[PDB]
Write a protein that binds this DNA or RNA. Sequence first.
RNA 1: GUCUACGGCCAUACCACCCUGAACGCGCCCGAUCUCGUCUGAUCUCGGAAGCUAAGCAGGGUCGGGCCUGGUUAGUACUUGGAUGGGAGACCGCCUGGGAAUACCGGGUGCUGUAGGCUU
RNA 2: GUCUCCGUAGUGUAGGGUAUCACGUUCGCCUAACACGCGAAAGGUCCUCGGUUCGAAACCGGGCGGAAACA
RNA 3: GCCCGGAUAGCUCAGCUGUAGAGCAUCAGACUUUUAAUCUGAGGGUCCAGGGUUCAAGUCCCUGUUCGGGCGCCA
RNA 4: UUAAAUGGGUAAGAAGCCCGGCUCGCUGGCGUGGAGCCGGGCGUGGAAUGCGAGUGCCUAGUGGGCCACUUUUGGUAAGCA
RNA 5: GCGCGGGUAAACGGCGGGAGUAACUAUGACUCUCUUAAGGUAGCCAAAUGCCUCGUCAUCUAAUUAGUGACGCGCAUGAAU
RNA 6: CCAGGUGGGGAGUUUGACUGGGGCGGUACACCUGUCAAACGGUAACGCAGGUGUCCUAAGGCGAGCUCAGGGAGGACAGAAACCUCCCGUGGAGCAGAAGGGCAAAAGCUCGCUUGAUCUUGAUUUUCAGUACGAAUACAGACCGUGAAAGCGGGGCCUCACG
RNA 7: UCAUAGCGACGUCGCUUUUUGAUCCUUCGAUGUCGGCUCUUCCUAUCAUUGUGAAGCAGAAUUCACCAAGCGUUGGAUUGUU
Lengths: 105, 159, 117, 293, 202
Amino acid sequence: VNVPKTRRTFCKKCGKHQPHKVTQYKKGKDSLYAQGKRRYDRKQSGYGGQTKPIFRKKAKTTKKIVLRLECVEPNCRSKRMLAIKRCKHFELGGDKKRKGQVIQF
Amino acid sequence: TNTKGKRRGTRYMFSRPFRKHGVVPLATYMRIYKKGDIVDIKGMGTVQKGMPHKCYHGKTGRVYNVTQHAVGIVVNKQVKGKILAKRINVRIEHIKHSKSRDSFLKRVKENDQKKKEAKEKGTWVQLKRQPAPPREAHFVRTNGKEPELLEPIPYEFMA
Amino acid sequence: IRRNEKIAVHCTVRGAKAEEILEKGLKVREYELRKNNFSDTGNFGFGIQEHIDLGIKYDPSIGIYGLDFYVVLGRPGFSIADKKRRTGCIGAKHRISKEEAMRWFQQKYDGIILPGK
Amino acid sequence: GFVKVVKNKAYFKRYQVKFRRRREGKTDYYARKRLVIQDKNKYNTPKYRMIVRVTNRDIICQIAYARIEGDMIVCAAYAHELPKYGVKVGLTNYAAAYCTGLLLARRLLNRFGMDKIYEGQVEVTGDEYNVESIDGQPGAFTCYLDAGLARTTTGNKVFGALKGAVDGGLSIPHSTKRFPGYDSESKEFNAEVHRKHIMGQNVADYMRYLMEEDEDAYKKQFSQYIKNSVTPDMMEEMYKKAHAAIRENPVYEKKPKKEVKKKRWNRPKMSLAQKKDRVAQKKASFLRAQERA
Amino acid sequence: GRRPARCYRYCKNKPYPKSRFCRGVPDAKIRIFDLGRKKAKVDEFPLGGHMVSDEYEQLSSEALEAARICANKYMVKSCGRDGFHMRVRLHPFHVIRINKMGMRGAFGKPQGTVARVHIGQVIMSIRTKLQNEEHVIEALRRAKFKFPGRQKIHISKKWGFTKFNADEFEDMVAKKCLIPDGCGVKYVPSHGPLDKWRVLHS
RNA sequence: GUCUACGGCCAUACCACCCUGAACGCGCCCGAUCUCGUCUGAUCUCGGAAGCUAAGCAGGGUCGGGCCUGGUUAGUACUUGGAUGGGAGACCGCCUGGGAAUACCGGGUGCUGUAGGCUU
RNA sequence: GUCUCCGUAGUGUAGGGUAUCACGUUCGCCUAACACGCGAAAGGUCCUCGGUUCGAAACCGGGCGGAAACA
RNA sequence: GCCCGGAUAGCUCAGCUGUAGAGCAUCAGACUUUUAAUCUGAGGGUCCAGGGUUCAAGUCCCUGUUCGGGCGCCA
RNA sequence: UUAAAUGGGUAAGAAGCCCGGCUCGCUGGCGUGGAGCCGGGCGUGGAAUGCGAGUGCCUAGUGGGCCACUUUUGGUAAGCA
RNA sequence: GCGCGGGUAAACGGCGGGAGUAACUAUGACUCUCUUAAGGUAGCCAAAUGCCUCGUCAUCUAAUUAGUGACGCGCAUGAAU
RNA sequence: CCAGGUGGGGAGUUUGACUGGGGCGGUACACCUGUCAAACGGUAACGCAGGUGUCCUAAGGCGAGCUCAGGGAGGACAGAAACCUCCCGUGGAGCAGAAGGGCAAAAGCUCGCUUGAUCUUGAUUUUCAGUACGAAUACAGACCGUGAAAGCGGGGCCUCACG
RNA sequence: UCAUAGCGACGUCGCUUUUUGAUCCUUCGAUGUCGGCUCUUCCUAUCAUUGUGAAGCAGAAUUCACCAAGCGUUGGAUUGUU
Ligand SMILES: [Mg+2]
Ligand SMILES: [Mg+2]
Ligand SMILES: [Mg+2]
Ligand SMILES: [Mg+2]
Ligand SMILES: [Mg+2]
Ligand SMILES: [Mg+2]
Ligand SMILES: [Mg+2]
Ligand SMILES: [Mg+2]
Ligand SMILES: [Mg+2]
Ligand SMILES: [Mg+2]
Ligand SMILES: [Mg+2]
Ligand SMILES: [Mg+2]
Ligand SMILES: [Mg+2]
Ligand SMILES: [Mg+2]
Ligand SMILES: [Mg+2]
Ligand SMILES: [Mg+2]
Ligand SMILES: [Mg+2]
Ligand SMILES: [Mg+2]
Ligand SMILES: [Mg+2]
Ligand SMILES: [Mg+2]
Ligand SMILES: [Mg+2]
Ligand SMILES: [Mg+2]
Ligand SMILES: [Mg+2]
Ligand SMILES: [Mg+2]
Ligand SMILES: [Mg+2]
Ligand SMILES: [Mg+2]
Ligand SMILES: [Mg+2]
Ligand SMILES: [Mg+2]
Ligand SMILES: [Mg+2]
Ligand SMILES: [Mg+2]
Ligand SMILES: [Zn+2]
C-alpha cells in the first residue's frame, strides 16, 4: 500500500486535529538490562543448555505495519502509533496514481 | 463441515421479492416505534447496515430502546436446551409493526365498550370467545328438486 | 492502438456556424449525397478527404487529413429528451424519418439524392 | 425479421416499474429520504422542508413535513400572487425569488402567532444573517431547503428564496457559498452584488444597457416591461414597497367561484358492452366489405 | 466396460444434470430423436401411437437408441420408408457416476447418461395413417423388449402429436381457430388484435 | 370535471401506436448582459414572453402486449398421521386430515393525502 | 485398467488470422559426360467427429488410436 | 536480525561525473579453387530499476529488485 | 414466476384499559415530542384442555453407541459408511 | 575456526542429456552444447546383479519357467565401493 | 582460570494429528460462498462446485454530474473489431478477488475537497459453554472531513481476509 | 437361399460364490499360513459311458439339446508353485 508522509489527524496532547508527519516504525534494539533479558541471561548461565523455547515455525508471511506519527506543532511534539493491515509491499509517500493515463505507450 | 458465516444459507432469505427490488419505499421509514410495542423482524436485504442475524428473521419481539436509526428489540431465541431473551439492534427497515397485538387491542377496546354499554341496560352479555360450537340443527329444503344421483366415472387411460 | 491514448478529436457545432460549415461541406460535393448515408433515425452524415481546398488554405506544418460530417436533424421540442427535470420521449409522429430527411434536403438545398442504382 | 426484438413479451413480464414520481422525473428518492426522514427517537417532531420550485412562468415555494399518507403543507407562497401588492412585472427572476421566500416567511410567522417576534431583517442587505432563538419566547422556526433536481451552483434562484426566507425569520442552516456575491477563485463573499441581484440591479443595468443598443431588441425582449411602463429606475422602491407590504399583510385568501357546471371535458371510458359491440360491427363491416368484392 | 443396466435402474440420486459443476460427461448414445417423414404436416398422419411406461425407473441413453432403431427398422419394413413419423419423448439428462477399482473420495466420475420416467410418461411417439394401427401397435411391442421396466401401449385419442382430440380436430381447423404449421398446429385464440383476425377469415 | 407544487401506496400506474384538449397551469419557445457553465447557452445557470399544442403532459381508443384479479386446471399434483395393506421389487391403493401451479377461458386497467389554480 | 503425452507433404518434423524445412520424386542450371552441387516445382482438409467464437490444424468437448508412468 | 560481494550488447567483464569500452558473440564484405585461415565493417547494452551529490554518474550515496555468500537467534 | 402439507415466532389483560396531575439538563415553532413519577376509576378474571408452581446449593456416572418406519448423502451393493 | 585459493579419488562417491554430420536405411568416426566436474574406458552379463522375462538364438530331452554357449541402448554390470 | 571454535567419541530427549487398518496421497486441522439441508434456526462424510493467509491514500469519506452490457441504423481511410452521432436498451455491465445477495439522476463511471482507516467509555450480535479472539451492529463523549443543507462518515456495499 | 440346424449385434432380465474387489461383524491373555503327498465324501453348470430328441444327420465322423453324478476322468519334462 501507499500512504502519504504527512496527514492531519487527532493529536492527543493538544486535543484537536493537527498536521502529523508519518514514518515507518522500527523495533529498537534490546536493552540487555530489562528484567526479562536479565532473567533469561541468568537462566542461560551455567549448564543445562537452552532453557526457553525457540519459535522456529514462522507461519506468517507478512507483518502488521505501524506508522509512527508526530504532530508538527513545535510546542508539543507527541508521537502516536497507528497500525494498518497486513501488506506484502509497503511504500511511504509514493507518487499518486492517475486514472486518465495511457497504460501503456 | 459447513461454515459459520454470518449470512450462510440466506441466498433466498434476504433476497428481495420478485419485481420489488430498488429504492426502499419511504413510508417504512416514517413509521413510529414506541418503547414496549411489538415488532416483527424481516431483514430487508437491500440495506447492509444493522442487519439482524438469520436466526432472528421472522421472529416477533418487543422494543426496549429507540435510537436515531434503529430500535432495540428483546426477542426470545431458543438455543438447543432452552430459550434466552436476547437483545439485538436492528435498523427500522428490517422490522415492521406487528398486527398480532394490534388485533387484540381492537378487541379489548370493542370489548370494554361492550362492558360499559351492558351495565345500564341490565342484561348479561358474552365476553369470552368460544371455539366454534356444533352446527345447530337445521332443515334443508328440496324445493321439489330431487338431489340427483352421483356415480363414479369408469376409469379410462388418458395418458 | 493501445487503450486510453488519444486517437480521435472532434467538436460539436450548432447554429449559424453549423449551417454554413455544412453547406461548405456539400459544396465540395456540389450538393451531392447519393443513396444511403441517411440514417433511419433522421440524421445523416458523410466524409471528405481534402480540407485545404475549402476552407482555410494550406498550412505547411499540418498534413493532409480527411474527416467526416454527421449532422443531426431536430424540431423544437427535441430538447425535452435532454431535460434534467421531467425528462421524456418525443412522441412517435413528432419523430423524424429517413423519408423526410431527403425531402428536407431536396426542399432546402435542392440537392440530388437516390441515383437510380 | 433480422434482428432480435428487445421489448418482447418476456421483457415486460419481468420488467420492474420505478416509483411513479421517479418515472415522471419530479423527485429523487435518494435525497428525499435523507431530507425527509425524522430521527427515530423523536417520534412525531416534524422535519420541516422549505420546498422551492422554479417554473417557466412562476416560482413555487412551500414549507412541508412528510407523513405516511403524504406531505402536509403548512403554508405556501407563490410568485403569481406577488402582483397582488407591489411588484407586477418581473416574475421568475432572482428578485421575485427573494420576495416569495420573504412572503413565505412572513405568512407562516403570522399564521403561527410568531410574527411579532423574530422580525428577521426589515432592512435588506446581502450579508450573512441567520435567526437566533430568544429565551422566554417561542423558539425560532427551523426548516431546511429542498433544492430538488435543480443544479445547486452558485447564483441559483433557489438560493435566493433561501436568503429571502431567512430574512423573514426562518432559521435555515446555510453557508454563504451559493449566493451570487461569492467569488469562487477568491473564496470571498462580496455581499453587495448579492443585494444588487436581490433588488434587481442585475437586470436593471442590463435593461439600462439595452435602450442605447436597440429598441426592437428592447421591445422583443422586455415587452411586458414596456407596458405598465416599468423604467430602469423606480424598480427599487417598488421592491421596497413589495418588501414592506409583505410585512404589513402577508396572509392569503381565496375567490369563492361556485358558478360552474358539470361539463365533463373528457370522455368516460367505454363500457364492456360498447367494446363487444364495436368489434362485432368491425367484424360485420369486414365480412360485408369482402362479400361485395 | 459398461455395467449391467440393473445397477442403475432406479431413480435414487437427486437428478444430476450436465452443468458447469458436472464437466467431463461422455456424449449420450442417442443423438437422433425424430425419424421418418418429419415433413408430414398435420393430416396425412392422424393416428398417434404412444408407448407409456409405468415405473419410476431410469432408461439408459443406450436403451432408447436400441429401442428407436428397432422401431424404425420395422416401420420401413411394413409401413414403408415414407409413411411414418417417430419421436422419442425422452432425453438422457440425468448423469450416472461410477467409482472405479478403498472408499476414499468415493464420489465417482460420470460414465453415462440416463433418462428418468414416471408412471404416466410416454417414451415413444408414432404418428401414422389410420390403417397402419396394427403395424404401430406391434412395432412398439418390439421396442418394448429393449427396456428394463414394464410398458403399456396406448393409442392416443388425440390427432397425431397435437394435444387436441382427433374427433373434434377436423371441425376446429375447419372453423379456422386451429391452423396447421410444420409437424404440428398453431392454436389461434380469439383475443388478439383484429388485424391478426382479419388477415385470415378472408 | 380537472390541473399545478409536494407526496403515500409503487404497472389496475408499464410499453407500443392512434384520436382529442375549453380555461388556468405545466410546457415547448426567444436570448446570453449579469450568475454559472460547457469544445458548443445542446445540457446546466441566468435574463424574458413573439409564437405553438407540433411534442412532453392530461383523457380516451386497441377482439393490443404486459400487469392486477377470478374460473378452469382440480380435490389433480403434493402432503401430516395409520395399518401384520398389495406388490419379488420399483412403487401403488386405502383410512385420517390439509391441499397447489401451468396451458386454456372471463373481468379490470390507477386509487388517494396536504396546499394552491381553472371550469356559469 | 487408470493416468500422462502425442497424431501434420511419400517419410519425418516444427508451428486462431491461409502449414516451415529435410530427405523421397520430378525437374532446370553447371559439365565433353557422369558424379556432386545449386535451384524450383509437386506434395500433408494437420487422426476423426461435435461445439465455441467474424474465422480453429491451433481453443474447448468426444471418439479412435500409439507410446510411455503408474497400477 | 547483522556484515556484506555481484548485477551492464543474446553471454561475461574493465571503465573517466567528461559522449560507454573489450571479448564470446551475429550478419555482411574483402580474403581466398574453397573451407579453414586471415582480417575489417555494420547492427545489437532488459547500463538491475527509482531517486538524490551533483555543471556533470555506469561509477559516488541511499531506496528498493533480484542473485549470491559469512555470522547471530527466549515471543 | 407461482407455491403447498408439515413447521417456527408473537398475542389471547388487573404488570391490562381509561382519566387527570407533576418532573426533565433529552426533543423542540408551540401547551411540541418522549420518558419517568404521582393520585384516581374500572372484575363478565376477557379461548379450549390439563396440571400445584417458583427458586437455590452440592453432585456421581457418561462423553466408543446401535437398530426400526419415514426423509436423505457417498456407494453397483452391502448385516456398508 | 568458517569463507577465499591450491592439492587430493588404491578419500566417500559420480560417470547423464541434447543438437548437426557419411552415396539405400540406420548409425555417427567428426563438430558443438546443457545441467552440478567427467560423461561407463578396458572388460563382463538375463550372472548370486535383467522389471518386461518362461528375453531371443543354438544345444541337451519325446517333452525342459531348469543347465550350458551366444546376443546386449545393461529397469539398475564395471574396474583395490 | 576464563573466552571462541571443533566435537554423534559420549549424554538427554523428540521425531504432530485426521485417516473406510497404517504408510504414501490429501487437509475435510483456522476460515468464507452455493448446495447437501427434508420451505424458522441447527445438522455429518477423505459429500459436490469453488475460494482465503491478500489488495487499496484510494478501490477509504462526503457532494455533484452521468449511465452501464449489448443491439439496430449510420458516417473518409476503417474492415468482424479504432473513432463520432442517433435510437432501443431493468441492468443482460461494473462494484479488487471465490460465490451468493444488493445496487440506476445508485453501491457503478468521471470530477472537487479531504483523512471518520483519528482520540475514548460502556451495551449488543455472531461461534458460544451464551468463555475468549476475530468480525460486526446500534449508541454516547471529543476532534474533524464533506455538502448549500438535511445529513453521511469513526474503513472497503454485506457475507472471510486472522492470533 | 432361410432370424432362430448352429449362431446373436444394439439392448435388457437374472443365477453362482470355484476369481478379484468392497466392508471390518467374529477371533490379536494366538483358530498354525502357499503348494505338494495321502484319504473320504459331496455338487452338477455332463468330458467319457447308459437311454433319448434335433441338424445344413446318406454312411462314418461331428454338433445342439433332455433324464442322468452310478462309474471313470491318467503317465511324465520345466517350475515351490495354484
Ligand atoms: Mg513487561
Ligand atoms: Mg454441507
Ligand atoms: Mg459448505
Ligand atoms: Mg460497512
Ligand atoms: Mg442532491
Ligand atoms: Mg458381469
Ligand atoms: Mg445416493
Ligand atoms: Mg391486453
Ligand atoms: Mg391424502
Ligand atoms: Mg470411553
Ligand atoms: Mg449406519
Ligand atoms: Mg587424478
Ligand atoms: Mg551409495
Ligand atoms: Mg559398455
Ligand atoms: Mg545384461
Ligand atoms: Mg539367476
Ligand atoms: Mg532335470
Ligand atoms: Mg547363460
Ligand atoms: Mg544419540
Ligand atoms: Mg433450514
Ligand atoms: Mg428445518
Ligand atoms: Mg449520486
Ligand atoms: Mg457538518
Ligand atoms: Mg460521534
Ligand atoms: Mg477381518
Ligand atoms: Mg482364543
Ligand atoms: Mg488374532
Ligand atoms: Mg485346531
Ligand atoms: Mg443338473
Ligand atoms: Mg458307485
Ligand atoms: Zn500536538
